[PDB]
Amino acid sequence: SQFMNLEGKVALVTGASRGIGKAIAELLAERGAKVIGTATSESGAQAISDYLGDNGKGMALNVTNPESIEAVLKAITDEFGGVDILVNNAGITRDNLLMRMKEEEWSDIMETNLTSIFRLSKAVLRGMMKKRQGRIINVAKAGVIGFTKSMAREVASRGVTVNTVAPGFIETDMEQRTATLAQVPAGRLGDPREIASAVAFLASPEAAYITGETLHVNGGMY
């Protein structure tokens, strides 16, 4: 039906090889989007191509490298058209033990988690604003929420919305679980499909009047 229909929309999903990212790309495809997901390797890309099938493809992308970003977007633009939906989900959620890390390892954690969001968002934004139509959904640092709301204010008048989905404890591959559960009023972990549901809602034409929002999907955790 016409309800939450993404047919004719080109969606780029970063970090799409498993868990939350793969749920997002699959659901966006189920709702009619043409989906391009990314992984850090070619076998990651290929696996994304496998599960998307005719609904999209995978591409290898290093979020920290402006050359990779520029090439990946050219490839997308040539084959599919300008990006209409951008889901920034790439992140190395890798034991931030800041005090003990080397400066170059710390540069990489920041470029991957934060700077990449800015770079990707900036690159797709020109097209969306020219079109008067776009969705950027950021799924890293707590600076993400600030960046979302600042960018949302700036681009709202040109038909582009910018929103954050903030997950709680989601069941990924990563006992002492009962310890975690006690912090969640719903008393259970989230399913990655429930983050994807939120993202997909925000990506729809029906969410055109929601921008600058943080959608918490966390079992009541606040």
Ligand X SMILES: NC(=O)c1ccc[n+]([C@@H]2O[C@H](COP(=O)([O-])OP(=O)(O)OC[C@H]3O[C@@H](n4cnc5c(N)ncnc54)[C@H](OP(=O)(O)O)[C@@H]3O)[C@@H](O)[C@H]2O)c1
Binding residues (CB under 8 A) for a copy of itself: these are 1, 3-4, 30-31, 66, 96-100, 103, 106-107, 109-111, 113-115, 118-119, 122, 125, 140-147, 149-157, 161, 168, 185-187, 190-191, 193-194, 197-198, 201, 204, 206-220, 222
d(CA 103, CA 156): 37
SS3 91: coil
State which residue, 129 or 169, has the beta carbon closest to ligand X.
Answer: 169
Place of tokens 């659901």: 27
43 binds, among ligand X, a copy of itself, none (CB under 5 to 8 A by kind): none
State which residue, 87 or 215, has the beta carbon closest to ligand X.
Answer: 87
Q: What residues between 97 and 126 interact with ligand X by CB under 6 A?
A: 112
State which residue, 103 or 175, has the beta carbon closest to a copy of itself.
Answer: 103
Nearest to 24 by CA among 189, 161, 167: 167
35 binds, among ligand X, a copy of itself, none (CB under 5 to 8 A by kind): none
Distances in Å between the alpha carbon of 173 and those of 117, 140, 154, 196? 24, 18, 38, 17
75 binds, among a copy of itself, ligand X, none (CB under 5 to 8 A by kind): none
Q: Which two tokens stand for residue 47?
A: 């696996």
63 binds, among a copy of itself, ligand X, none (CB under 5 to 8 A by kind): ligand X
Q: How many CB atoms lie within 10 A of CB 205?
A: 13
Q: Where are the alpha helices (DSSP H) in 31-182?
A: 42-52, 66-80, 103-110, 116-131, 143-155, 177-181
Binding site residues, ligand X, CB under 6 A = 15, 17, 21, 39-41, 44, 61-64, 90-93, 112
